Amino acid sequence: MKIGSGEKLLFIGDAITDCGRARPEGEGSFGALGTGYVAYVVGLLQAVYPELGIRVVNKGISGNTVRDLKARWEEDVIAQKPDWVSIMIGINDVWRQYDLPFMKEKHVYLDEYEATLRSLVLETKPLVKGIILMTPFYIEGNEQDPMRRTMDQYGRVVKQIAEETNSLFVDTQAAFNEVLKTLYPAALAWDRVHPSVAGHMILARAFLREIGFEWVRSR
Amino acid sequence: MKIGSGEKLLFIGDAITDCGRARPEGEGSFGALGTGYVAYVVGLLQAVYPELGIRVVNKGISGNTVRDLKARWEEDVIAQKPDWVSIMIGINDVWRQYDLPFMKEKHVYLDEYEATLRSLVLETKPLVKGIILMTPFYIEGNEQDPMRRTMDQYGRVVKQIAEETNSLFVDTQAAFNEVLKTLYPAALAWDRVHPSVAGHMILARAFLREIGFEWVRSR
Amino acid sequence: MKIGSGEKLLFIGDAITDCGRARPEGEGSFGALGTGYVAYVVGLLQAVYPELGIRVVNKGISGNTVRDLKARWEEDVIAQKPDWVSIMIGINDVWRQYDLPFMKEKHVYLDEYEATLRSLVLETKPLVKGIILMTPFYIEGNEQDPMRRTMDQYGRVVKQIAEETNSLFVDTQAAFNEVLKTLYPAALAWDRVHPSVAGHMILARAFLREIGFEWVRSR
Amino acid sequence: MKIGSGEKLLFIGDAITDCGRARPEGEGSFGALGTGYVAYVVGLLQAVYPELGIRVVNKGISGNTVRDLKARWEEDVIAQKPDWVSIMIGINDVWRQYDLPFMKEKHVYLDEYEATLRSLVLETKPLVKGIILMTPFYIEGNEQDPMRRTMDQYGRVVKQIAEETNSLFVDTQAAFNEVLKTLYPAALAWDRVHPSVAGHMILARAFLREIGFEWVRSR
Amino acid sequence: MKIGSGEKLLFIGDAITDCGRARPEGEGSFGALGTGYVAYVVGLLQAVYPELGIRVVNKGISGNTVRDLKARWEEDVIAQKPDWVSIMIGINDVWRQYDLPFMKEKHVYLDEYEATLRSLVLETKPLVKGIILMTPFYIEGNEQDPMRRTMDQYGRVVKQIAEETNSLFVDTQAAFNEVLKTLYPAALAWDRVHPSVAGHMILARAFLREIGFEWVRSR
Amino acid sequence: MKIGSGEKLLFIGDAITDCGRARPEGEGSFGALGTGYVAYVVGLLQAVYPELGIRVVNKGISGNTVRDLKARWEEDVIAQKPDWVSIMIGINDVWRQYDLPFMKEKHVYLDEYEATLRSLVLETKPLVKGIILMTPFYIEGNEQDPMRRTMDQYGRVVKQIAEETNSLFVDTQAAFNEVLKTLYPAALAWDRVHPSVAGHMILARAFLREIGFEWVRSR
Amino acid sequence: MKIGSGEKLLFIGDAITDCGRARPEGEGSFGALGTGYVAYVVGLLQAVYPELGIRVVNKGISGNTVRDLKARWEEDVIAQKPDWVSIMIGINDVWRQYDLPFMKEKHVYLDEYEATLRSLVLETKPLVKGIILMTPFYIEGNEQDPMRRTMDQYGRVVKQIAEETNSLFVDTQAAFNEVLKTLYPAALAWDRVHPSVAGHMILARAFLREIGFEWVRSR
Amino acid sequence: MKIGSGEKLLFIGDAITDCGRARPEGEGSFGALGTGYVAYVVGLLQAVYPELGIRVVNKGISGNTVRDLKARWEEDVIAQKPDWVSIMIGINDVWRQYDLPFMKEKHVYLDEYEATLRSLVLETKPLVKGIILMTPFYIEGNEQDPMRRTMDQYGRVVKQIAEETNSLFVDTQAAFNEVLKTLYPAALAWDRVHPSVAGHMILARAFLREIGFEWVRSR
Known part of the structure; x- marks a missing residue:
């Protein structure tokens, strides 16, 4: 498991990460972590590695x-x-x-995205033990849907940043795509973004797998 | 204007028609019509044909x-x-x-749909001056998206029923399709179903056009 | 159409314009525009000119x-x-x-009104592409009702300011007066000011007509 | 004072009489009478005739x-x-x-009104000590405003019924008319119906005057 | 009537005056005056002297x-x-x-009361047209109840201040005492302080009488 | 301790006994007993006699x-x-x-009171181990205050019924009287009825003393 | 995976199973399953076996x-x-x-418990494909804590019933015991019963393991 | 009784002391003291020593x-x-x-606890008339439960501080332990910390006994 005892793991992101977490602190075992993938990761780590003693902040x-x-x-x-x-x-x-196409100042285009994410990762890398970069995603199985096509591009940038910088990498999109071979997006997220428990489990599992979590520890 | 003075016009449907209308009665000028296309239709008919004294029920x-x-x-x-x-x-x-693909008792397949809608029209036809059949719609430009493809199947049946029964007919999907040449669905409805004011306006306008509304009357 | 692609159209006013818009920003497609004529204008523009790509702020x-x-x-x-x-x-x-006749500091009399509106228009004219001046209104069909008589005077001042300065002009009063040939004020607004959807449609249509909106574009 | 010691005085009417009174019973000193003219009448009768022990029901x-x-x-x-x-x-x-001119089932025309009010009075007269008939009112000074003109028609019938049945009689419209020589309606009621405390006081006072209340008793 | 046209009358006090008035402004015709004696005074003045054009602030x-x-x-x-x-x-x-006998810093004893009220009246007298000093009260008919006995003392101080300074004077206590010849305190105020509408009418009438209000103006 | 192990003790009365207890059942350790003297009695019995296993219902x-x-x-x-x-x-x-002196159907005079209370005791006596009769009370030190004077009349009847039926007896008025040598009523209850925690404690203690509670047991 | 395609899996129990599920029906993807272990089970089954089309009811x-x-x-x-x-x-x-040791009608002792649970299993067995019996649990590491000791007695009976009836069997207490080698109960549940997300995860995982869930399928 | 007339007694602590007290002031007879042991102490002192005239602050x-x-x-x-x-x-x-074992900065270990409590007592002792030091507690009867074992250690430190400094001392733990000979913790506090009325009575009685309160004063 990549994360070790006594370490502090900090998750950051948008609503998909927030999921109603406690502001500002975002920390503790009884609801402050919100109700989505971040809480599920912490729960599963505690259930299977209670002794690792990790602190998690949302x-x-x-x-x-x-x-x-x-x-x-x-x-x-x-x-x-x-x-x-x-x-x-x-x-x-x-x-x-795509949803406010004419409010351009709200848009963060690929140049700004690459440059900014790059700079945050480079500044953070020497100050911490490790960085996990998760791709954004869109719950949509058609690669040529315009927003899915753009989202995949943004994930390619995350993947190069994680390779230019050496970070762990979680392709959340590939995790959804597998389920989307069976389910129409609306079964997971009416709006193709904010999903059900099942979607947050897809995310939590994609994270855990990248950090070497075992469902049943060997022995 | 197909609708005559003193007549009663009744809308029925799902949430798109509902839009928070007053239950049970769904009738009045100050909010009981809800906040979507039905209300817009009434508003425009009153703004442009105040003398018609049309009663509308939602x-x-x-x-x-x-x-x-x-x-x-x-x-x-x-x-x-x-x-x-x-x-x-x-x-x-x-x-x-598509959202509850394994709770089948929630689904109405196209055979049942068609016979049931025909039954509504056939019962009602002899009791009224006219019937307007509006297609369902899905705010999604790709004809091959599985749900858009199904939706079009149902809209084709609506159109056939209208032809067969001599009802008026509004193709709501065609109205959206035009706008979807410019806008990505999310700019109209995150969930591809429940739309912004603009979407309700697309509907209202499509209805009004079919009943012979004039934006500036020659009368 | 007087408004062109990529342009930003900003509406300002009192409750009739506000209609519960989001504060402070007043901007976006999903409710921030409020629930009255401003949202209806934006909806109709999007329904009929989706490609114009206009930004609207309330x-x-x-x-x-x-x-x-x-x-x-x-x-x-x-x-x-x-x-x-x-x-x-x-x-x-x-x-x-008229409603607080003895709280005079709350009153903005014709001198202050003309001088202030004049000054705002003159200062704004060289900084923007265009200005639309809409008259105030009172939903009251008797010209000799004292408040209607005063409101018509204030509209005359708006009309001269729009002519001294060259702005577009919308006579909202004349739009109501036409409907008031049929309907008693209370059918549109108990208080002769805050109207139903129908009143906001009268306003939205009076605006759109002034800016050259077409209900069905020719072709 | 027409009302005698130990007697029960019952008010009936619409919202002007209601004013949030307690349902069903409408009886008590601490709020059940609502917050308008009925409550004011009781308050004044208690302040000036505490010994009368009058029970009032709203x-x-x-x-x-x-x-x-x-x-x-x-x-x-x-x-x-x-x-x-x-x-x-x-x-x-x-x-x-006037506000729902096309939902006729909401309207009571003057013929029906008169016979129905006469029926209430005629049934009740032999069972009580007295009846007080208060006219309806519309807070509008122009006699030719269509709704004021209709209202006066109904008030004239009330006055005739009172004369014919020997009931007491309060002309609420005449009480407002006096005040409307100074105030524009909006200063009393935006909607010309539901008034400020001042309007409820105009009503209370008009009632009290008709039952022989003295502001400072000679007794 | 002591108060004249165009004058501004400002009421100040504790809950008995506040009665839920709008903060901070305390001014206007539609609820800002609160729901007790101050609103009743304003209502009665408007009902009987609408032309006096007074502004009232709570x-x-x-x-x-x-x-x-x-x-x-x-x-x-x-x-x-x-x-x-x-x-x-x-x-x-x-x-x-009496209710917090051991929290002495909350108490304002007779020395502090006389000295402070005196100083406010003296400072205010030359800056205004007139001052009305209303006694405090306790709704309790036994002069030897200790709190009533103290309250009467405090009213004696108000009365000398109004005589040392020449102000109008309203003995609210004497107004209650008259009613208390008939009613037990609890009929007006469970807590002997915050009364029903009837109590606020007793106060409003005691005020109005002092300023020369006539219930029916002579002529 | 008169109350024995495993027994059920049921309190009945008005708001003083109620104090927000859970309806209908009024039974449990975590709030269903309400927040006044009943709850206090149970709390003390549990704190000092936990082994008694007394069930209490409010x-x-x-x-x-x-x-x-x-x-x-x-x-x-x-x-x-x-x-x-x-x-x-x-x-x-x-x-x-005293608070509704003219709604007589709300009043129970002493004759009816006495016979009715006797009927409750006489029906219940043969079915239970014991009955405790607590007097009503009024937090008012002057015996000649009309309501205190009436209250004492009713408490005297309670005491007589207890004597006659061999019930236990708690004089709540005497318990308050002692405290009222120091405190003005308002320090215990603005309304002279519904008291502070201290008043509920005065009641609880008076009850406990009558059933033979020891604050520090010799057992 | 013991559960087959298209099958219906129904959970029953107390608050640990409930977790705010929708009443009465307890069925759906977007919240009706509540927010605990049942929801987690469904989420994981959908994330890893989306094709199974398992219907779950809470x-x-x-x-x-x-x-x-x-x-x-x-x-x-x-x-x-x-x-x-x-x-x-x-x-x-x-x-x-243990919390209401003297309201015995709330208690179900082990004899009654065992026969009643056997009755549920025996009635249901012939109607279903399978039964899963999950033990109760108490989050408390000391086997001699009186409530843990009782709980273990009941869990032993569950295990015997499962053996006897050939039901599947989940020892929830054993799952907690493992985690309680590291964590003090309070880190999982202040009240030793209702747990954090981590506790719900411990349960979900224990259930999933018994039905043959694979975290990464070989299929 | 250790506390004397006119003295101000200030309680400080955590939730067990707060119990919803009014912030910031924490002072007065009608709810500002919260709903637990502090209010019960004040109530009992007032019931039995009303003349002591003590002020209490929470x-x-x-x-x-x-x-x-x-x-x-x-x-x-x-x-x-x-x-x-x-x-x-x-x-x-x-x-x-124990509940957040990995958030170490939230922990106040024995060194910090002794040093800080010591310093507050030493600084406060010369500025006041007296100090009462109450031990913390845990409602748990097994001395070897790890949190109870730690809590007893912290109480030993309070006891030495109260002896190094001469303060009154209340062993709240010993008061619970006596009741815990009969009741399982959950009967008093599901979470072993926040108890029922009974627990707050145990605390209030433990306090009162230390300050020489008598349930029935001798005489």
């Missing part, structure tokens, strides 16, 4: 783009002195291009 | 399939003694097939 | 007079860098004279 | 026409065994004709 | 003693530039001595 | 007179099969006479 | 003992025609004995 | 540790100029070690 904020992450990075990431930082950002960067 | 109920309309048809339609009945149904009949 | 504030407009003009109009500004102000300027 | 119900009063008359009036009954009805009977 | 604050009045006097009285100031203070000054 | 209902207790006696008392019944009633029977 | 009801399950068994279980039934009951049967 | 704050006490000590204790200070702190200092 700094997700509904509505955020990577520009919003940059503006709060000092106080919400650096100042928390985490050991591990998990980032999942891009959904809003992209979605605003 | 019997939409969110969640309904055509099976649900049949169950309340005597009480909600027949007993109201309308002069004109406008039906818009099918969205849920189809949506359940 | 800066209406319930209770305002033109004195209140002046106090927030810098931040709420100039600083938004709009291309088009639509103003509809005067109802409260006048109504306070 | 059976107003907002929305009612005289057709609605007849429907509840046995239960709300007759069964209460009052000594004095005060009726104020007609505002809605008339208002619906 | 600056009452629940919980206040005269020490609290002094701390806000500049902003809430002087800065409002009233023509007439009505003060009714003392209830809490006294009640705290 | 059947107080705010507003009740002894006429109301008789109406629910079979269901609320007899059917519960208690071992001990504690009654406290009379406050309202008397209070209505 | 019939938990907070507060229930096995006596309560028997009372609703025909309606909540039998009439639902499930393929698999999972039962988790006993926590309350035991807890009442 | 400065408890839910969640506090002794580190939190130190941070607010100046404003909430010293600045209130109390005569007597009662402290009960330690529950959270300890509980966080």
